[PDB]
Amino acid sequence: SPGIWQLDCTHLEGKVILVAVHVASGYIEAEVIPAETGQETAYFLLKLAGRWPVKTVHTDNGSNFTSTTVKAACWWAGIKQEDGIPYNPQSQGVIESMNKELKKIIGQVRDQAEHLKTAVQMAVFIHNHKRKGYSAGERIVDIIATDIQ
Amino acid sequence: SPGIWQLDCTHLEGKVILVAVHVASGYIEAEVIPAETGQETAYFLLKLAGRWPVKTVHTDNGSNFTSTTVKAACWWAGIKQEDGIPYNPQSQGVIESMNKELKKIIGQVRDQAEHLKTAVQMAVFIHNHKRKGYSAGERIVDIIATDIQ
Numbered sequence: 239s240p241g242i243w244q245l246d247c248t249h250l251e252g253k254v255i256l257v258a259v260h261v262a263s264g265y266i267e268a269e270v271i272p273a274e275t276g277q278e279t280a281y282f283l284l285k286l287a288g289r290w291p292v293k294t295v296h297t298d299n300g301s302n303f304t305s306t307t308v309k310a311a312c313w314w315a316g317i318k319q320e321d322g323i324p325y326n327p328q329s330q331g332v333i334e335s336m337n338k339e340l341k342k343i344i345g346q347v348r349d350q351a352e353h354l355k356t357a358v359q360m361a362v363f364i365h366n367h368k369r370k371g372y373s374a375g376e377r378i379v380d381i382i383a384t385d386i387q
Numbered sequence: 388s389p390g391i392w393q394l395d396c397t398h399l400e401g402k403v404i405l406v407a408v409h410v411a412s413g414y415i416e417a418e419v420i421p422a423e424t425g426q427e428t429a430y431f432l433l434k435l436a437g438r439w440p441v442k443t444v445h446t447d448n449g450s451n452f453t454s455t456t457v458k459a460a461c462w463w464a465g466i467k468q469e470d471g472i473p474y475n476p477q478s479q480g481v482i483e484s485m486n487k488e489l490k491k492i493i494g495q496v497r498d499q500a501e502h503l504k505t506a507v508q509m510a511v512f513i514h515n516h517k518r519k520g521y522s523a524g525e526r527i528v529d530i531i532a533t534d535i536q
């Protein structure tokens with residue numbers, strides 16, 4: 239579980255917010271893209287895997303699962319590309335709740351930036367630093383350090 | 388120590404590569420931008436600070452030190468903005484060598500992507516995973532985890 243991430247795509251303001259969640263910690267990375275293509279998703283994963291030890295990614299839909307560009311990025315970065323089928327039905331709910339929380343935070347910061355991308359990074363910061371007590375950013379570091387040790 | 392980062396700007400293919408180095412570990416984050424403006428630097432720091440516990444940033448030049456947009460991002464993210472004067476003369480050398488290493492890696496991957504941005508992310512990945520023994524990505528996690536405990 240230290241290496242398991244889940245992709246998630248949500249929409250706001252006619253744009254797409256692509257999110258990666260570290261399953262065990264709830265820590266997130268996100269970016270704003272005009273639309274979700276295999277190429278965008280591939281690039282996002284390359285970025286993520288250079289920053290954290292990404293072992294497995296549960297893809298957000300069947301098009302990204304199928305995408306040869308996404309498969310090429312996962313090959314390149316040594317990531318096991320998996321489906322995102324919620325065999326544990328609780329997964330759907332957690333993701334839904336996370337998207338609603340993220341959108342809430344984006345609304346709370348929306349007037350502090352002209353561009354949606356800025357508001358999204360502000361939301362990422364707030365989400366990752368929120369003590370719920372440890373923050374998600376604290377949990378991910380502890381989890382991975384324990385793994386190295 | 389666990390919270391100090393150094394900004395660094397280097398050029399390739401008529402584009403700018405903006406880099407943040409975690410001083411204690413040598414772990415890096417980087418992005419390709421058309422030119423180094425206060426706004427680009429501010430957005431980059433916002434991204435970085437949402438992902439790692441950024442306490443202090445040594446800015447890469449006086450323009451980014453002066454930039455009110457950069458100061459506004461440092462205020463927003465709770466970062467102490469500092470100069471990057473190399474009071475320790477070893478700093479210039481270390482940065483220079485890192486830029487040289489990064490450009491070498493980018494050359495080694497350059498034909499595996501059409502776009503420079505992709506090559507740069509591949510280079511970040513290789514740099515952060517390289518065992519020197521531990522990798523920089525291992526070092527940063529251990530340093531921050533030790534700090535949390």
Ligand SMILES: CN(Cc1ccccc1C(=O)NCc1ccco1)Cc1ccc2c(c1C(=O)O)OC[C@H](CCC(=O)O)O2
Pocket residue numbers: 275277278279280281284307310311312314498499500501502503504505506
């Ligand atoms: C499609 N490309 C195929 C290619 C072209 C030439 C040489 C090798 C390859 C190859 O298959 N390499 C191995 C591989 C695939 C994925 C990771 O490694 C790779 C690629 C992917 C995503 C991108 C890219 C690029 C690029 O070519 O630079 O460019 C930036 C873009 C930004 C996001 C957006 O704009 O959608 O995301």
Ligand SMILES: CN(Cc1ccccc1C(=O)NCc1ccco1)Cc1ccc2c(c1C(=O)O)OC[C@H](CCC(=O)O)O2
Pocket residue numbers: 349350351352353354355356357424426427428429430433456459460461463
């Ligand atoms: C300049 N802006 C001032 C502003 C405009 C409107 C409302 C509030 C503010 C304000 O001062 N907010 C507090 C603050 C400043 C920095 C961090 O928080 C903030 C901003 C900065 C960098 C960016 C931005 C934006 C943006 O407005 O969205 O947009 C994307 C861009 C991408 C990189 C590139 O294209 O250069 O980087």
Ligand SMILES: [Cl-]
Pocket residue numbers: 366367375376436437438439440
């Ligand atoms: Cl964090």
Ligand SMILES: [Cl-]
Pocket residue numbers: 287288289290291515516524525
């Ligand atoms: Cl890594």
